[PDB]
Amino acid sequence: VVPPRSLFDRA
Amino acid sequence: RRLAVDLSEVVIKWELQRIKDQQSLLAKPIDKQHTDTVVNFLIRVACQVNDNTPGEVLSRRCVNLLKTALRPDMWPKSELKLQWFDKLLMTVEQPNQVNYGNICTGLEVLSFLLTVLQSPAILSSFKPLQRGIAACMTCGNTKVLRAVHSLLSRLMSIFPTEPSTSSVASKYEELECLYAAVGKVIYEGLTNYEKATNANPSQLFGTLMILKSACSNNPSYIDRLISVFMRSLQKMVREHLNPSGTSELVMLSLELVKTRLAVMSMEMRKNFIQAILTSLIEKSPDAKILRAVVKIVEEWVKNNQTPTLREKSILLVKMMTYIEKRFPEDLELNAQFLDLVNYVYRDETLSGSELTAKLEPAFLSGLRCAQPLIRAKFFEVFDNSMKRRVYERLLYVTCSQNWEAMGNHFWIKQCIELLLAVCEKSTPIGTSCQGAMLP
């Protein structure tokens, strides 16, 4: 299971 | 005197009727010399008639009558007799007894003549005035300071001050002495406030207004004075944080240096960003100051002429901590800050930056905002951050979203909002409860 990316993940 | 003003008004109304008729000895225009002497009498009576402590109303009537006398149709390019103003403005020098109202009316008339006259006529006519205008900039009366500020603002808008720290104060001899006096008074006022062992910011007031006038149509002008002005700004902020016009002077000073970051030294730039603006955000009690700082930061963000991403991050983080905490009741200030945060999260350049990671508490404040328009804009950003699927959003709320920054908020509201967004919207409303429906 991979958590969905959020606006606060530092890409 | 009122009767004399009435006669002047009669001549003006006769020329208004002539304009109406023209739109032959009865239709021919008045002889110009009579118009000239009527204009000059109106100017003189308007500047004279104000009382030292009523004639004020007759002054206002004369001013309006002069504004009607000088129009694109009534008597453009009349002569003028301005030399007498030299004596009047010099009276500002004499502190025993001076008719301040006369000075203010004369300065207003001068600014009107600056909108009236053609540029070569402006340059030719204003040369003797330079001593009188320079004299006004020294007196402690705030009204005269504001009047001369408006006059100089209009004049310097017509003819901007010289850049590059050029040696001449102006390329125009008729402006050279006045602009030299303006520069000298700015420098002396800033140096005096720097030197002062204990003084109110009010001493700066005239200096700051004159400086603002000098930079109105030439942003580069403060590059001459940047070090001394920055030290004066530090002294102003320190006096404001540890004590009504102080706020106005701080806002004016901030508006002056907001675009001269590339001129300031690295230490001065660091002090301005991480010391002055940060201490205003954290300590300053005036919400107008906060609104001004947030406007400056918003202009910076929406644009080497602008601060680096690290400085923007520092300011936004300080605002995110302090603005909600210190001013919960100020809905407009919080709306402005959340509009800025919304722009940041909408911006594609800043997406995925450390800044968007650092502003997550502000974004969650926007999602739980009590103002529905803000809440809607933040949810619109939030909605597009993930795919319109039930499983993925349930996974998001279980796994991706740290809900700690919501605080005591019942963030189940945001879960409901997020999942119901998945539902089809264009389907006609309906039910499975056919047994309960009205037939």
Helices (H), B51-99: 55-69, 85-90
For residue A1, the chain B residues in CB contact (below 8 A) are 395, 399
Least CB–CB distance from B392: residue in A4, A8, A11: A4
Residues 6+ apart with CB under 8 A from B180: B169
Helices (H), B159-244: 173-195, 204-214, 226-241
| Cβ within 8 Å, pair B392-A9 | no
Please give the residue of chain B at the shortest CA–CA distance from A8: B357
| Cβ within 8 Å, pair A7-B354 | no
Tell me, rounded to whole angstroms, the distance of Cα B438 from its chain centroid. Answer: 63
CA distance B301 to B312: 7
The beta-carbon contacts of B185-194 under 8 Å, at least 24 apart in sequence, are B185/B134, B185/B137, B185/B138, B185/B210, B186/B210, B186/B211, B186/B214, B186/B225, B187/B225, B187/B228, B190/B225, B190/B228, B190/B229, B190/B232, B191/B228, B193/B232, B193/B235, B194/B228, B194/B231, B194/B232, B194/B235
Least CB–CB distance from B352: residue in A1, A3, A10: A10
Q: Assign residue B172 a region (left: φ > 0; alpha: ψ between -120 and 50; beta: otherwise).
A: beta
Least CB–CB distance from A7: residue in B356, B387, B392: B356
Q: Is B108 exposed, middle or buried, given 0-12, 13-18 or 19+ CB atoms closer than 10 A?
A: middle
* B156 contacts B213 by C-beta, under 8 angstroms: yes
Which residue, among A1, A2, A7, would best test binding to B if mutated, counting the most B CBs under 10 Å from its CB? A7
Distances, alpha carbon B203 to alpha carbons B139, B173, B198, B232, B256, in Å? 11, 30, 11, 11, 18
What is the resolution of the experimental data for this entry, in Å? Answer: 2.3
* B403 contacts B413 by C-beta, under 8 angstroms: no
Helices (H), B273-424: 278-283, 287-302, 309-326, 331-346, 354-358, 360-367, 372-384, 390-395, 412-420
